[PDB]
Amino acid sequence: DVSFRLSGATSSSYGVFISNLRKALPNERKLYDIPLLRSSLPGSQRYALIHLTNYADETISVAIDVTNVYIMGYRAGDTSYFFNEASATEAAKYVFKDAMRKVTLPYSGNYERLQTAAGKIRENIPLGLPALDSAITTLFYYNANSAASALMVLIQSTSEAARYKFIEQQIGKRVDKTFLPSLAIISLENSWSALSKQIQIASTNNGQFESPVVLINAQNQRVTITNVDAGVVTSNIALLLNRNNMA
Numbered sequence: 001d002v003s004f005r006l007s008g009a010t011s012s013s014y015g016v017f018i019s020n021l022r023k024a025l026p027n028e029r030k031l032y033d034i035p036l037l038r039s040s041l042p043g044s045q046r047y048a049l050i051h052l053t054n055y056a057d058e059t060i061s062v063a064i065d066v067t068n069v070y071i072m073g074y075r076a077g078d079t080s081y082f083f084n085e086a087s088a089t090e091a092a093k094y095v096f097k098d099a100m101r102k103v104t105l106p107y108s109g110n111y112e113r114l115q116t117a118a119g120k121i122r123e124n125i126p127l128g129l130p131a132l133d134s135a136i137t138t139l140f141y142y143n144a145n146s147a148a149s150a151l152m153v154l155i156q157s158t159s160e161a162a163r164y165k166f167i168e169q170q171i172g173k174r175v176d177k178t179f180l181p182s183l184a185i186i187s188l189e190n191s192w193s194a195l196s197k198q199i200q201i202a203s204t205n206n207g208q209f210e211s212p213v214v215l216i217n218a219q220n221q222r223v224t225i226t227n228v229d230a231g232v233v234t235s236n237i238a239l240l241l242n243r244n245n246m247a
């Protein structure tokens, strides 16, 4: 299990938390010094639990699938909450089994569904450590109308931070402030599967992608990424989705 406590948290201690979350994920190999995640694991090995505690000492436990860093659902007290999808129904056979109530959320855990349900796009939802505190409080005292936006804060602060060093560093900097994510963060979130696939292809193709990936950089320019010597591959992406795990 991995834990993070917001009371007394610093940039350094969020960095230690995201390091430990990456270390909790099993990898087959490394390609270009980046962990390649497993394609399939038995249910008994497939899930990791993250414990998150806000400023008021209220704790939720979040279940993640370690093959794709996907959040399956969370527990608050005696009640578990799972996303309305196939992988989350599978997850509920293995985690939070002694929860007295189980609630199935009225959506799946993908962004197009969560943004529709929240009525807000990712660019307009604050991130930073105080926004994670707020997200924990909202999810602990489950308010249906505010859950979807809180779950997007939670996903971006744990899963997306683990996938990219840039996202980890941007969220971790904001200890007593909040910020709105740039299109650079949004395009990294959007492009993880495609970048992962192309880096796996590149290892059999002399470091060259078969299909380019278009990212948005810090100056809001569309940049076309074509190989493993690009900065996003050398010094940013921290985990690779297995090619067998993309559908």
Ligand SMILES: Nc1ncnc2[nH]cnc12
Binding pocket: 069, 070, 071, 072, 109, 110, 111, 155, 159, 160
């Ligand atoms: N539920 C989720 N967990 C992790 N990463 C995601 N990207 C979109 N939805 C996600």
